[PDB]
Write a structure and sequence with these properties.
Elements (H helix, E strand, L loop, with lengths): L4 H4 L4 E5 L7 E5 H9 L3 H6 L5 H15 L3 E6 L8 H23 L3 H8 L7 H12 L4 E4 L4 H10 L5 E4 L3 H4 L4 E4 L6 E6 L15 H11 L12 H10 L5 H6 L1 H5 L7 H16 L1 E4 L4 E4 L21 H8 L19
Parallel strand pairs: 2-3, 2-5, 3-4, 5-6
Antiparallel strand pairs: 1-7, 6-7, 8-9
Bound molecules: manganese (II) ion (2 copies) and sodium ion.
One manganese (II) ion binds next to helix 8.
The structure holds a DNA duplex (13 and 9 nucleotides).
Length: about 350
DNA sequence: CGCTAGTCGACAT
DNA sequence: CGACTAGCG
C-alpha cells in the first residue's frame, strides 16, 4: 500500500462502529480477513495438512456484519497484474524460504523461530478463497472475484454507489479514490473510518485533497506500481503538489528539485513509470456486476488510448469475465471448478 | 523535520 | 499489510 499514509492523514479518521451502516451495503477486502485467519492455522497450512479455521474466522466477521442489518459484498483478488508478476513471485520466493527454513528450525527444536517463519510463509490461494466463497454464499452473502486486484473492484463498487463503505486494512483504497474506507475493524465491529470529504481536516495536505492530486501524492511518495525517487516521501511529494498548481504533472515531476530545493535528476524510466502507475490507478480493469462486463475503473478520457494499457489489465469475453467473477472459472487454468448460478 | 530500511505483530491459547 | 524506530540527509 501507501506506506505512512494512515498516519499522514491521521486527522481525517474517526472511531466508528459498523452499526452506522445498518441497512446499507458494504464491500469487503476479504484478503485481510483471510490472511488474519490463516495466521492461526499457519503451521497446518504450511505443512499441507488439512485445515479450515480461516473459513470460520472470516465467517465470524461475516455473521457480525449480518447481525447489524448490514449487507456485505465479499471481494477477492483475481489475476495478478501483468506488471506485478516480479514482485509477487519474489514474495513467493521469500515465503517458500521461510517455509523450508522454518522446517529446518523445527528440526532444531527452535519452536518460536519456527512459528514466526511459518507465519511469514502464508500464501493465500484461490482454493481457500473459494472455500470462503462457498461458506458465505451458503449464508446468502454475495461474493465477487475481481478481474485483477480487489482494490480497484472495491473502489468501483464504492464509486458506483453499489456499496457505501469499504472494509480493508490497505490504504491503497484511498489512492483509488474511495469515498468511505473502514480500517482496523475487529470481530465486534469497532474500527477507524476515513472519509474522502474530510481529507480537508488534514492541514498537511493543503490543497492536495482533490482525488487527482491525492493520487499523484500517493504515487510520488512510493506505491506498489512504482518505487519513489530517493528521498521522496509523503511530505515532500505533498509539498511538490502544493507549490505547483500546474495541471501538467509531467513537467512538474521533471522539475521536482526546483520545488523541493533539492538536487534531483529524473530518469525517463520514472516518467514512463509514473504514467503507467497513474494509468493503473485510473484504468485498471474491473467487473461491472450489474451490466455484467469488463470495464475500466474510471471511464477512458479523450487523452488516453486504451490500446496501450495492457499493464492495467487485459480484456476477455464478457461471459468468461462473468464466470471468473462468479468464481466458477479458475484464475490460472481457466477451468470450470464450480457452477454457481445467481439467477436461480 | 523528513525519508529509508528494517523489525515486529497479526491469531489465540 | 501497518505500526514503529534507529540511522541518516
Ligand atoms: Mn489488495
Ligand atoms: Mn493494494
Ligand atoms: Na518513498
Amino acid at each position: 500500500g501507501i506506506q505512512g499514509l494512515l498516519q499522514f492523514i491521521k486527522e481525517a479518521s474517526e472511531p466508528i462502529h459498523v452499526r452506522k451502516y445498518k441497512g446499507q451495503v458494504v464491500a469487503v477486502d476479504t484478503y485481510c480477513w483471510l490472511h488474519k485467519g490463516a495466521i492461526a492455522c499457519a503451521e497446518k497450512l504450511a505443512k499441507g495438512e488439512p485445515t479450515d479455521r480461516y473459513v470460520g474466522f472470516c465467517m465470524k466477521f461475516v455473521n457480525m456484519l449480518l447481525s447489524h442489518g448490514i449487507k456485505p459484498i465479499l471481494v477477492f483478488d483475481g489475476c495478478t497484474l501483468p506488471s506485478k508478476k516480479e514482485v509477487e513471485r519474489s514474495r513467493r520466493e521469500r515465503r517458500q524460504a521461510n517455509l523450508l527454513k522454518g522446517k529446518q528450525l523445527l528440526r532444531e527444536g527452535k519452536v518460536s523461530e519456527a512459528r514466526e517463519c511459518f507465519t511469514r510463509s502464508i500464501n493465500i490461494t484461490h482454493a481457500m478463497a473459494h472455500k470462503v466463497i462457498k461458506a458465505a454464499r451458503s449464508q446468502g452473502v454475495d461474493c465477487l472475484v475481481a478481474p485483477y486486484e480487489a482494490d480497484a473492484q472495491l473502489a468501483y463498487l464504492n464509486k458506483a454507489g453499489i456499496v457505501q463503505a469499504i472494509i480493508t486494512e490497505d490504504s491503497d483504497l484511498l489512492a483509488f479514490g474511495c469515498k468511505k474506507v473502514i480500517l482496523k475493524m475487529d470481530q465486534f465491529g469497532n474500527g477507524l473510518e476515513i472519509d474522502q470529504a474530510r481529507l480537508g481536516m488534514c492541514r498537511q495536505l493543503g490543497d492536495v485533497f482533490t482525488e487527482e492530486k491525492f493520487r499523484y501524492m500517493c504515487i510520488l511518495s512510493g506505491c506498489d506500481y512504482l518505487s519513489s525517487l530517493r528521498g521522496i516521501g509523503l511530505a515532500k511529494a505533498c509539498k511538490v503538489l502544493r507549490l505547483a498548481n500546474n495541471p501538467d504533472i509531467v513537467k512538474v515531476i521533471k522539475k521536482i528539485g526546483h520545488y523541493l530545493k533539492m538536487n534531483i535528476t529524473v530518469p525517463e524510466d520514472y516518467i514512463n513509470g509514473f504514467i503507467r502507475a497513474n494509468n493503473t490507478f485510473l484504468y485498471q480493469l474491473v467487473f461491472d456486476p450489474i451490466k455484467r462486463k469488463l470495464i475500466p475503473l474510471n471511464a477512458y478520457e479523450d487523452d488516453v488510448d486504451p490500446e496501450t494499457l495492457s499493464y492495467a489489465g487485459q480484456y476477455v469475453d464478457d461471459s468468461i469475465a462473468l464466470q471468473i467473477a462468479l468464481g466458477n472459472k479458475d484464475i490460472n487454468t481457466f477451468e470450470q471448478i464450480d457452477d454457481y448460478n445467481p439467477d436461480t
